[PDB]
Amino acid sequence: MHRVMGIETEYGISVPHQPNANAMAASSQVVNAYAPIGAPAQGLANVILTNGARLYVDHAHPEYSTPEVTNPRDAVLWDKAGERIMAEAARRAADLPMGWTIQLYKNNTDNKGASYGCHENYLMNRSTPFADIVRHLIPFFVTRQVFCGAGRVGIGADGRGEGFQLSQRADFFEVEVGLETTLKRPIINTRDEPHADPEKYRRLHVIIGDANMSEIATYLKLGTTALVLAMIEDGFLSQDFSVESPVGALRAVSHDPTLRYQLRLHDGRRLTAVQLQMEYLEQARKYVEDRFGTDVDDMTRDVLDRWETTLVRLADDPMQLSRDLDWVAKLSILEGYRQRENLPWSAHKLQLVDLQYHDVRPDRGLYNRLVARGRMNLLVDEAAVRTAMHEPPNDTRAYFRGRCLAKFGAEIAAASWDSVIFDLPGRDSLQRVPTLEPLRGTRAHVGDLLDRCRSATELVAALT
Ligand SMILES: Nc1ncnc2c1ncn2[C@@H]1O[C@H](COP(=O)(O)OP(=O)(O)O)[C@@H](O)[C@H]1O
Ligand SMILES: [Mg+2]
Ligand SMILES: [Mg+2]
Ligand SMILES: [Mg+2]
Ligand SMILES: [Mg+2]
Ligand code: NA
Structure with missing residues (x-):
């Protein structure tokens, strides 16, 4: 597979026992504590690192934006390096005189009403009509959370509805298409800042995804999307997958982690999110055969195969994917607490555990503790x-x-x-x-x- 892409991740941030600490100041300490080994980016801290990434304060959060990569495995690798950079930056910030102790979370919500972004960026050809991008990505984005979701305890933007849902971000999106990233959030963001010749290129700016810890999830997220984009750009997709009420469907799909919720398509078809994803997988397979045949590269074949396998296992029993998907691994942990301690989904301790999953510290983050026990499927090794x-x-x-x-x-x-x-x-x-x-x-x-x-x-x- 070969398409220029990159991931921006805004990190959740807190200063324990300083509960009202200014988040911009705390974010600045993080970035400034790592800045000795980068250069200023062209009044908050904002630097370029020697791996080609950007590290900066995006208003209330420290943000790491990967260097440009060409494939979803390298996207996983340099995105994971960003987690290590954040952890080291927070460690260093605490060592400086008057430095705060700062905790960082690779997620999308503080469970207190705030929502922040993990953005995917994909190089596209200017000659692809934006209407086609919109028509074909909305149904895909609504349904891909069945393997991309990081999981969230609490239902609704304020998190006070009782239950577990597939995605952190679903409750915070309100419109189908538009420019903002922090208010009236759109399923399809229209920002057009390509950082390249705008006559040839567009940087498609995707803002709907949860930050993932699992390498398999980040890999599938970027890889399956990239394959769908290749179909859009060539004009391959004949079907119209439009869903009747995309924002409503985004939330309903998220709020049913049994994966039984049936979407209503414009044509009256009732499909589960998994089933609509299967129709995208089958189209992807026909497209790669028609454009590459038996000459398919190994990474494209792997993404196709993993996408198909995951959907089949989700339909059979999602819990067999606990080594692969964040929402499944996190749900597994949460159900363990519910069983051991007899907690309902509204218990405050479950929202603490939800957040702990994403802690960047190697011994405190629950994802990192699973990895330390060899309990998650990995795509890259720590040396890399x-x-x-x-x-x-x-x-x-x-x-x-x-x-x-x-x-x-x-x-x-x-x-x-x-x-x-x-x-x-x-x-x-x-x-x-x-x-x-x-x-x-x-x-x-x-x-x-x-x-x-x-x-x-x-x-x-x-x-x-
Ligand atoms: N032309 C492009 N196509 C795809 N990705 C790009 C392109 N130019 C830069 N990127 C990637 O886009 C992201 C830019 O990060 P950032 O500066 O935070 O973007 P934003 O303008 O959305 O804040 C990075 O991950 C970078 O690798
Ligand atoms: Mg950014
Ligand atoms: Mg940002
Ligand atoms: Mg962005
Ligand atoms: Mg920008
Ligand atoms: Na933003």
Whole structure:
């Protein structure tokens, strides 16, 4: 599989025993405690890291945005590195004089009414009609939470309805299509800031997904979506999967973790979320055969196979997926508490456990404690994750960005997705090197050049 993509994750943040601590100040401490090993991004803390990622305060939250990658396995890897970066940043923040003790959560709600975002970004061709993107992604986004959901205790935006639901974010979305990300949240966000030539490219800005801990969930989330987008772009999909009341269906699907809720399609068909997902899987399979046949790459085949297998197991018995899906693993933990301690779904302790699942600390987060016991299926190994904290992917412009920050960090004034700004001794003016093509500036393009250059001056000279 090959499509430029990236994940932004806004982290939940709290300062224990300082319950009214200013969240912007706490977020700033986190980012500023990690900033010694990045460069300012082009008045809150906002930096680029040597792995090509952005780390910044997005109003009330610290946010980590992966470098651009080309496939869902690398998306998992550099997104997981972001969890390690957040944990280390909070650890370092506490070591600084007057530093606060700050807890961070890779989730989407504080269970107190606030909701924050885990955004997926997908490079698309400008020539794809946005109406087609909307028509074909709304039913997919409504139903993919049967394997993408992270689980949530509490029903409704204020979390006071009693029960468990598939997704953290479903209750906070109110419209089908629109521009905002924090109010009147739209299933299809229309932000158009491509960080590339807008005549050729669109960055599809997806805001509906829960942050996932499980690598299988993040992999399926990004991979299945990317396959659906390939069908949209070519014009492959003939069927109209439109659902009658998309916002209502998003919530109803989430509120039924038995996976029996039947959606009403515009054509009167009644399908479960799993069944509509199966119709997307079967279309994906016909599309890959028609465009690739037996020449399908191994990662595309793996995503197709895992997507199909997961849907069959969800239909048979979702609990056999506890090593794979966040909502299933979390539900398993929660049902254990309900059995051991005779707790109803409204018990406050279950909302604490819900949040603990997402704690970035290796010994305190419940997902991390499952991984420590080898109880979750993983796609990458920890050695690779640690490397990915500091080194970029080799096959996007993040390579050029991250390696320049590592090797020429003394001469970088700022950087962003679309440029690196150099300060050369003896040159009066700052030197802006644009990086407009997401697939230029790879190790194949510039690895040897960067190896050879001993200074930013030699690099900048070579590029003009
Ligand atoms: N042209 C593109 N196509 C797809 N992903 C992109 C593109 N440019 C940047 N990205 C990815 O988009 C995300 C941008 O993060 P951020 O700056 O937080 O975006 P936002 O403008 O939504 O806040 C990153 O994960 C980055 O890798
Ligand atoms: Mg962002
Ligand atoms: Mg944000
Ligand atoms: Mg975003
Ligand atoms: Mg932006
Ligand atoms: Na936002």
